[PDB]
Design an enzyme around this catalytic site. Structure first.
Site, PDB file in Angstrom:
ATOM      1  N   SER A  45       0.760  -1.258   0.000  1.00  5.83           N
ATOM      2  CA  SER A  45       0.000   0.000   0.000  1.00  5.83           C
ATOM      3  C   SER A  45       0.787   1.302   0.000  1.00  5.83           C
ATOM      4  O   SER A  45       0.197   2.361  -0.184  1.00  5.83           O
ATOM      5  CB  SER A  45      -0.983   0.072   1.179  1.00  5.83           C
ATOM      6  OG  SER A  45      -1.983  -0.930   1.062  1.00  5.83           O
ATOM      7  N   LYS A  48       0.243   3.837  -2.750  1.00 10.16           N
ATOM      8  CA  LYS A  48      -0.896   4.748  -2.822  1.00 10.16           C
ATOM      9  C   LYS A  48      -0.518   6.224  -2.695  1.00 10.16           C
ATOM     10  O   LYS A  48      -1.228   7.093  -3.216  1.00 10.16           O
ATOM     11  CB  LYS A  48      -1.944   4.344  -1.773  1.00 10.16           C
ATOM     12  CG  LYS A  48      -2.541   2.984  -2.092  1.00 10.16           C
ATOM     13  CD  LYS A  48      -3.403   2.457  -0.954  1.00 10.16           C
ATOM     14  CE  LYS A  48      -3.685   0.952  -1.110  1.00 10.16           C
ATOM     15  NZ  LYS A  48      -4.435   0.459   0.084  1.00 10.16           N
ATOM     16  N   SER A 105      -6.224   3.314   3.797  1.00  9.02           N
ATOM     17  CA  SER A 105      -5.580   2.342   2.918  1.00  9.02           C
ATOM     18  C   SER A 105      -6.607   1.480   2.178  1.00  9.02           C
ATOM     19  O   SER A 105      -6.422   0.266   1.976  1.00  9.02           O
ATOM     20  CB  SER A 105      -4.600   1.468   3.703  1.00  9.02           C
ATOM     21  OG  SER A 105      -3.537   1.042   2.863  1.00  9.02           O
ATOM     22  N   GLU A 141      -4.774  -3.916  -7.297  1.00 12.81           N
ATOM     23  CA  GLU A 141      -5.161  -4.566  -6.041  1.00 12.81           C
ATOM     24  C   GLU A 141      -6.062  -5.716  -6.497  1.00 12.81           C
ATOM     25  O   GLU A 141      -6.896  -5.534  -7.391  1.00 12.81           O
ATOM     26  CB  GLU A 141      -5.986  -3.625  -5.157  1.00 12.81           C
ATOM     27  CG  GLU A 141      -5.185  -2.489  -4.572  1.00 12.81           C
ATOM     28  CD  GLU A 141      -4.477  -2.870  -3.293  1.00 12.81           C
ATOM     29  OE1 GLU A 141      -4.487  -4.064  -2.931  1.00 12.81           O
ATOM     30  OE2 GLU A 141      -3.911  -1.970  -2.644  1.00 12.81           O
ATOM     31  N   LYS A 209       2.412   6.481   5.452  1.00 11.57           N
ATOM     32  CA  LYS A 209       1.601   5.507   4.715  1.00 11.57           C
ATOM     33  C   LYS A 209       2.198   4.127   5.004  1.00 11.57           C
ATOM     34  O   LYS A 209       3.381   3.890   4.755  1.00 11.57           O
ATOM     35  CB  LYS A 209       1.618   5.758   3.203  1.00 11.57           C
ATOM     36  CG  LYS A 209       0.692   4.784   2.417  1.00 11.57           C
ATOM     37  CD  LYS A 209      -0.793   5.069   2.743  1.00 11.57           C
ATOM     38  CE  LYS A 209      -1.717   3.918   2.378  1.00 11.57           C
ATOM     39  NZ  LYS A 209      -1.627   2.851   3.409  1.00 11.57           N
ATOM     40  N   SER A 210       1.378   3.224   5.540  1.00  8.45           N
ATOM     41  CA  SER A 210       1.840   1.871   5.854  1.00  8.45           C
ATOM     42  C   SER A 210       1.432   0.879   4.768  1.00  8.45           C
ATOM     43  O   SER A 210       0.750   1.228   3.816  1.00  8.45           O
ATOM     44  CB  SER A 210       1.244   1.414   7.178  1.00  8.45           C
ATOM     45  OG  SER A 210      -0.170   1.463   7.117  1.00  8.45           O
ATOM     46  N   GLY A 211       1.880  -0.361   4.904  1.00 10.04           N
ATOM     47  CA  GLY A 211       1.490  -1.364   3.935  1.00 10.04           C
ATOM     48  C   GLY A 211       1.633  -2.746   4.539  1.00 10.04           C
ATOM     49  O   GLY A 211       2.461  -2.963   5.429  1.00 10.04           O
ATOM     50  N   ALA A 212       0.802  -3.675   4.074  1.00  5.71           N
ATOM     51  CA  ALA A 212       0.891  -5.046   4.527  1.00  5.71           C
ATOM     52  C   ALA A 212       0.469  -5.893   3.332  1.00  5.71           C
ATOM     53  O   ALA A 212      -0.554  -5.629   2.714  1.00  5.71           O
ATOM     54  CB  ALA A 212      -0.031  -5.284   5.694  1.00  5.71           C
TER      55      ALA A 212
HETATM   56  C1  LIG Z   1      -1.786  -2.204   1.506  1.00  9.44           C
HETATM   57  O1  LIG Z   1      -0.669  -2.559   1.814  1.00  9.44           O
HETATM   58  C2  LIG Z   1      -2.982  -3.083   1.842  1.00  9.44           C
HETATM   59  C3  LIG Z   1      -3.823  -3.531   0.620  1.00  9.44           C
HETATM   60  C4  LIG Z   1      -5.070  -4.386   0.904  1.00  9.44           C
HETATM   61  O2  LIG Z   1      -4.307  -2.361  -0.069  1.00  9.44           O
HETATM   62  C5  LIG Z   1      -3.811  -2.414   2.935  1.00  9.44           C
HETATM   63  C6  LIG Z   1      -4.545  -3.385   3.889  1.00  9.44           C
HETATM   64  C7  LIG Z   1      -3.740  -3.224   5.137  1.00  9.44           C
HETATM   65  S1  LIG Z   1      -3.911  -4.345   6.533  1.00  9.44           S
HETATM   66  C8  LIG Z   1      -5.688  -4.023   6.851  1.00  9.44           C
HETATM   67  C9  LIG Z   1      -5.903  -2.847   7.850  1.00  9.44           C
HETATM   68  N1  LIG Z   1      -4.639  -2.208   8.253  1.00  9.44           N
HETATM   69  C10 LIG Z   1      -4.478  -1.881   9.589  1.00  9.44           C
HETATM   70  N2  LIG Z   1      -5.384  -1.923  10.516  1.00  9.44           N
HETATM   71  C11 LIG Z   1      -2.918  -2.157   5.073  1.00  9.44           C
HETATM   72  C12 LIG Z   1      -2.018  -1.672   6.157  1.00  9.44           C
HETATM   73  O3  LIG Z   1      -1.117  -0.896   5.884  1.00  9.44           O
HETATM   74  O4  LIG Z   1      -2.135  -2.037   7.437  1.00  9.44           O
HETATM   75  N3  LIG Z   1      -3.041  -1.527   3.833  1.00  9.44           N
HETATM   76  K   LIG Z   2      -1.454   8.429   6.932  1.00 11.83           K
END
Ligand SMILES: *C(=O)[C@H]([C@@H](C)O)[C@H]1CC(SCCNC=N)=C(C(=O)O)N1
Ligand SMILES: [K+]
Ligand SMILES: [K+]
Ligand SMILES: [K+]
Ligand SMILES: [K+]
Ligand SMILES: [K+]
Length: 263
Positions: A45, A48, A105, A141, A209-212
């Protein structure tokens, strides 16, 4: 400070996986500290932010409008669409989609925005055109989060992403109005709380901005600094770990606790 590298390498050890890290001076562009700065990691993510940067570039050029409304359907919803799933009836504006894509996200929001600029190939062309010859988006996505070992699709390098974020937040790439709009979306947050924000001192500024993704991939990009103003960019990525999300979050928070302490 090298004490932060102690924590970063400890994180690799604790997670049994690769950790990429870079701390950059926002004003000068100087790399203050790094670990595997030029190895590729899935962006997940964090792309984004780059996507909305491209959208805002189009807005500046008069090729897009933040108030333009986009209508979509159930057919368009992909996994993790906490905001877009609530607006099927009347749609969402471009501004609302970037707010959703960055602060929550939202994945569908990212796909709708990608469609407006011409897809992954155009975001990649935008990045190359701005001097980032490394970062590439290849898929949409949810596939872009696959995190296949050794696959270069949808990846960046910590140094490349840090340099790109710096250009977006300080370069003449965007108008001041657009630059600030991007920063405003990044300052807002509903999902990255367990990460760098959990180590941020009172009064400090942070736009992030985080990502998983799959296969243990986790990461975060951020501009942060004391007294309500950003002064450094931090990028952290990891992939390959079998650790829980809480464990991965804690390691990122501890890396943050260290860089803040040794600021
Ligand atoms: C991006 O890296 C992903 C992808 C689905 O767009 C999203 C989903 C998540 S984890 C779900 C909720 N996050 C935290 N409570 C993230 C994320 O960065 O945590 N982005
Ligand atoms: K943010
Ligand atoms: K150094
Ligand atoms: K490297
Ligand atoms: K609809
Ligand atoms: K954070």
């Amino acid at each position: 400070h090298p004490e932060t590298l102690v924590k970063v390498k400890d994180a690799e050890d604790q997670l049994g996986a690769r950790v990429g890290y870079i701390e950059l001076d926002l004003n000068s562009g100087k790399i203050l500290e790094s670990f595997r700065p030029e190895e590729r990691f899935p962006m997940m993510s964090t792309f984004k932010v780059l996507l909305c940067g491209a959208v805002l570039s189009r807005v500046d050029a008069g090729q897009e409008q933040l108030g333009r409304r986009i209508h979509y359907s159930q057919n368009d919803l992909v996994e993790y669409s906490p905001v877009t799933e609530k607006h099927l009836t009347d749609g969402m504006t471009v501004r609302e989609l970037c707010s959703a894509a960055i602060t929550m996200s939202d994945a569908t929001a990212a796909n709708l925005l990608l469609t407006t600029i011409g897809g992954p190939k155009e975001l990649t062309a935008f990045l190359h055109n701005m001097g980032d010859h490394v970062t590439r988006l290849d898929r949409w996505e949810p596939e872009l989060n696959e995190a296949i070992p050794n696959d270069e699709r949808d990846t960046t390098m910590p140094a490349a992403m840090a340099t790109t974020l710096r250009k977006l937040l300080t370069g003449e790439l965007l108008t001041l109005a657009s630059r600030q709009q991007l920063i405003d979306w990044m300052e807002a947050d509903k999902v990255a709380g367990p990460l760098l924000r959990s180590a941020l001192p009172a009064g400090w500024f942070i736009a992030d901005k985080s990502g998983a993704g799959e296969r243990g991939s986790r990461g975060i990009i951020a501009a942060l600094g004391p007294d309500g103003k950003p002064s450094r960019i931090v990028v952290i990525y990891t992939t390959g770990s079998q650790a829980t999300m809480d464990e991965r979050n804690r390691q990122i928070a501890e890396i943050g606790a260290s860089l803040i302490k040794h600021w």
